Design an enzyme around this catalytic site. Structure first.
Site, short mmCIF file in Angstrom:
data_model
loop_
_atom_site.label_atom_id
_atom_site.label_comp_id
_atom_site.label_asym_id
_atom_site.label_seq_id
_atom_site.Cartn_x
_atom_site.Cartn_y
_atom_site.Cartn_z
N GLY A 27 1.83 -2.04 4.63
CA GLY A 27 1.64 -3.36 5.19
C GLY A 27 0.52 -3.26 6.20
O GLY A 27 0.26 -2.19 6.75
N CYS A 33 0.80 -1.23 0.00
CA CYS A 33 0.00 0.00 0.00
C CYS A 33 0.84 1.28 0.00
O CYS A 33 0.49 2.28 -0.61
CB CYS A 33 -0.93 0.03 1.23
SG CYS A 33 -1.38 -1.58 1.94
N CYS A 92 -1.02 3.21 4.89
CA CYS A 92 -0.45 1.96 5.37
C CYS A 92 0.78 1.55 4.58
O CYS A 92 0.94 1.95 3.43
CB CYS A 92 -1.48 0.82 5.28
SG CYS A 92 -2.96 1.09 6.33
N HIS A 114 -7.54 3.48 -6.20
CA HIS A 114 -6.41 3.06 -5.40
C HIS A 114 -5.45 2.18 -6.19
O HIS A 114 -5.41 0.97 -5.96
CB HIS A 114 -6.92 2.28 -4.18
CG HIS A 114 -5.85 1.91 -3.20
ND1 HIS A 114 -4.63 2.55 -3.16
CD2 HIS A 114 -5.82 0.97 -2.23
CE1 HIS A 114 -3.89 2.03 -2.20
NE2 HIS A 114 -4.59 1.06 -1.62
#
Lengths: 388, 384, 364, 363
Positions: free
Chosen positions: A377, A90, A375, A345
């Protein structure tokens, strides 16, 4: 020996494409190359000045692939320049920026290109299963592959909703507002400055220029969201309407030491004030941006009230609510042009994408301080404070 | 259709477990080993080979011709055409059928046919769109389509009233049959041992099937939980596995075999394919076998040995019962529940196993049959 | 005894251009239309069909069988076995070959064979093939100008053919939905470029190599379309009282040496002619698929083919190349033109992978 | 502002196991955890002092996997501490140390654990290798004969045998317990004793017909971990921990397409330039020996004295657990610098076929 200040002198993103949408035929390398060449061109940067390239990307066709190096070559950057591909899930796109800044402050480099790119539309066809998804039964389900790890992340979001007591209604309200904010921004052409248009072939002998984000859903209502079925858990609260999508796009920034920018005559768009990353307890997986941001703020000697604009990536409304509530971020300062629930995303790119969006909006509003966080992870977060 | 087609050479590698002995020995390597040994055993001149047709399901992409890679690796001339058959479960037997019809057509005199699969390596090199299918539990990928087939098996079990206990009994017989066959070195003749190499340095020699579960008892199966339906009847114990292996046969016209001084192992007497109604998905071997038997002018009682691939005990029970097959004639050295199911190779593998057992028993007739997709089956009758 | 194989019905849809008329018309829909029409043209009873074999490249689903879905849609009984052939560019011709084999073997009496492709709808879609073409160009010393003029001639022939409605007999029109309640009938090919010129071709940039000779103008595009043929044993065609459109005289396939990759049609065609006892001079009409002008030059020159006999109504460079369907498409085109010219012998040939070729000889 | 000096205060490695060998049942996580705990324990470091964990690994990098983090958790490091797994192929283990160093110089962290771990036994070997051909192309391009490659390989084995006979790796190795009997593995498994030039010359080419690269003049597939603890000099003084070495400079560089696999050459020149040093100023060099052909090119083009190069043997003899090797050669360098009481060392290897990375350290 003195520590250098790192500035961002150029920043651009492609539009964000929907899954199997406008960029189905425009690879992650192509998207990244377009954004890199535009970043360079806008500030008239000589290719001979680039010291390193660091680019986020998650879904690769196998080990040994260096998407960042392919991009740098396509962009005409000399082969002697080292390029690195960052896979940090991410947060890859923002981690790349952080790694670039560290390498400047250490004295290793003076000029670094950093960002992220992802084409998730193409991944099911060219990425091996072991890199494309994770096994279920990680909790019957076992022996099934979870594409893009989306189901594991949705369960993590459901668990956040349960522990923090966020209802379906609360999650849908945040999602609705993300869409409201994107729609108003797009109506006002808010993204015009930051977007590099991308040419695609829509039919033989016909090129179309894509300059608008594809994923926002026009005229969405609270009633409509309320009708959607739970996506990951029976009698759950997380739906396809209050989570982001699967998306394609790229975003690139050019970093320099203040001294190098001055020498070159290039004016900074922003300055990097601080950054940090942090892990969380397993009870609150997915809440990484909270301790990361507290840590980055503390490093900068700031509190959240000192921050004019915040970009916190919105993978899930449940997680977005936790971040907003625990950091005490005022609605008026958070993802003001919409978040990923509306915008999309593209995983390797989003960390860079939100930083680009942040900088341009700070500039439009003439405000002094901003923050980007997401984030890196399920167990960790990364956060970066920038100033104008 | 004047030419008579005979099988003059037949070989298979051991069958490896998922992530087991062949995790470092690819579908190409396994297939090359089997091809070279099949040629070597009858002293076949490489210039006699007219075509190579090899089954394989899991591919890194389109434009991949695994069969040609094997042919080249085997030292077969580049001028020889090679074709890779991807017809799922039935690929290895369909390859033999295609080889046979290319000889009967007069197109070819000598054809190498079979199948190869390495499913252990597939997650690491095969794109998701080719590796599995979508569920609907939607947005979840069914690896190897095993969940879809498992549900198809449960539906057969429901339709035909095959209990958990009946399925486990078949599975138990399969395991115990394989165990005793292995104890008596029954597969020795048909197996080519596989040397595991890393950069052409030998690490080990595999000459035994890895997948059978020795010492299996009925309680060992009854204790397992359903794999596909809550309160279902299909388990990991009464279904076959995910496996690695290859099997190759050499087909010739009778005249060509005679000229070469090569004695046939078997003659192909007939083959057939057939589709089924959607209510009885997975039952393809039944109408295919009836069709093939009618073409041969035989009935099931005229067949001495049957190999019907055992992907699921539920499906095997249907085949056995609907064709009225004597249990003592069926999968006598064990079936895929015990031995494994390398999907591209299995159709050819069961034919190899059938032929060697017919020869050991000195009987006259045999048949091999399995699915060629959920909606279809394929069947082949051979004689000695 | 060996059965003689005839073709008793042959049809193709128009060829749509990428993102063109057939963008919402799937390979299955196109295939089903072509199959249903092939059956109705000879009034064939559905119960007579023994097998269906259909080429298709881009529907790569594990457990997916486009040929069977097409068979079902066309009302063919579920007991009939159907097979999807993925052999890249050769798929549609390989299907016909397999169909013929299964009839000669005595397995089948009546087989439906062909190919279908919708490249527009491919979720992800020539690079390596292009380099192969560039390599042929180098080895055989074919210049940019030589390739462009072949492309030009292919366009000219297609323009002439279409001007004279040459494809009217072989084409089955396809209804498409433009909006709710309104359908439009497509009865014409979409890919031919009218009035393309030498100077227009000469200005194009090389498609693959930096200083290469292969371009978008001298190579085929990507396309949507289907083509279907019905094969029978001569005996069966008699019993049903259906006159052959053509008779399959021979076929063959062959591999090539690594140095000459993409030249598969050459030794495949030589092999097929040898099996037929014919030479290239005995053939009246030749359809050699034109994916790249560079490879088309090789095939033409090495086989010593008279250009007045080759792809007389245009080749794929002008007409389009729906990959899974092309093998069958050219055979359909070959057959109808043989009828018009009242000639006796025809040949279709194309690649079946970079390293191999397939060829078939038919007679009238 | 002011730029902090980075010192290495702890350094350890596991033995290197052979493919299918002693660590067949000891995962990258387990090997990595053992190395981390020992590195920490050796300097009596309080777990609360650790700011970040950065660990190289190649084969266990699937979606949502974080080997470094699992290792940190197993070693008892607080969950608030961020951990990152570095996948940069061969260079992963040295890149991790470099990233650790930069995060200390940036002022972000004061104490970082860095290194690498790999268990190649537990991963599939798929061929139906790209490194081997690159090596063949280097052999062809630079005109390295089969005999030259085998001579290097033999010397590597001989140096390893000499070092092991003198228990040279005793200080740097942490023993690993493996399985109901439990055997402590305290020696490297991979070196081939009694290695002769003749036995090497009998091997078949591994990658190309009539090729020069074999299994004997290339490194093996191996299992092992190596970890180091980095601090600012100030933090080390505050904790009262004496440094083993100081990081003087590092650099990475890409190569031209014609000379793939030669990354360590321009990376080393770049790193030496940043140090204010020439190659002749370096007392010991560890350049990872993935292939003899490649090592020959690195050694020749940089004009390295053979008597200073991989003095205790290279990867051809010791093994090449890919995600660990970058860290492993640095550990080996540091211990040997201390035994010889010399001042400057250099460690270098590839980080992709197109790139290299180098680090200069002093004592």
């Amino acid at each position: 020996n003195a520590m250098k200040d790192v500035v961002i002198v150029s920043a651009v993103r492609t539009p964000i494409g929907s899954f199997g949408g406008v960029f189905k035929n425009t690879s992650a390398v192509q998207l990244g190359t377009i954004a890199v060449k535009e970043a360079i061109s806008r500030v008239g940067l000589n290719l001979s000045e680039i010291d390193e390239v660091i680019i986020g990307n998650v879904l690769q066709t196998g080990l040994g692939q260096n998407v960042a190096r392919q991009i740098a070559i396509n962009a005409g950057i000399p082969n002697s320049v080292p390029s690195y591909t960052v896979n940090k899930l991410c947060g890859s796109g923002l981690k790349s920026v952080q790694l670039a800044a560290q390498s400047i402050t250490s004295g290793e480099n003076d000029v670094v290109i950093a960002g992220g790119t992802e084409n998730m539309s193409q991944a099911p066809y060219i990425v091996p299963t072991a890199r494309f998804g994770s096994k279920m039964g990680n909790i019957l389900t076992d022996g099934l592959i979870d594409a893009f790890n989306q189901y594991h992340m949705g369960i993590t979001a459901e668990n956040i909703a349960t522990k923090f007591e966020f209802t379906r209604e609360m999650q849908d309200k945040l999602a609705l507002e993300s869409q409201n904010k994107a729609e108003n921004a797009i109506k006002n052409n808010r993204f015009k400055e930051e977007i590099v248009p991308v040419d695609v072939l829509i039919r033989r002998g016909k090129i179309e220029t894509i300059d608008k984000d594809e994923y926002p859903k026009l005229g969405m209502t609270f009633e409509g969201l309320s009708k959607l079925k739970p996506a990951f858990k029976k009698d759950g609260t997380v739906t396809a309407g209050n989570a982001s999508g699967i998306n394609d796009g790229a975003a690139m920034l050019i970093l320099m030491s203040q001294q190098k920018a001055d020498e070159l005559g290039i004016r900074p768009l922003a300055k990097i004030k601080s950054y940090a990353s942090a892990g969380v307890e397993p009870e609150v997986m997915g809440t990484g941006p909270i301790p990361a941001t507290r840590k980055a703020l503390k490093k900068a000697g700031l509190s959240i009230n000192d921050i004019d604009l915040i970009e916190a990536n919105e993978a899930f409304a449940a997680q977005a609510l936790a971040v907003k509530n625990e950091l005490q971020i005022d609605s008026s300062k958070l993802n003001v042009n919409g978040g990923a629930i509306a915008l999309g995303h593209p995983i390797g790119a989003s960390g860079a994408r939100i930083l680009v969006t942040l900088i341009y909006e700070m500039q439009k509003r003439k405000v002094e301080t901003g923050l980007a966080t997401l984030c890196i992870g399920g167990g960790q977060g990364i956060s970066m404070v920038v100033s104008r």
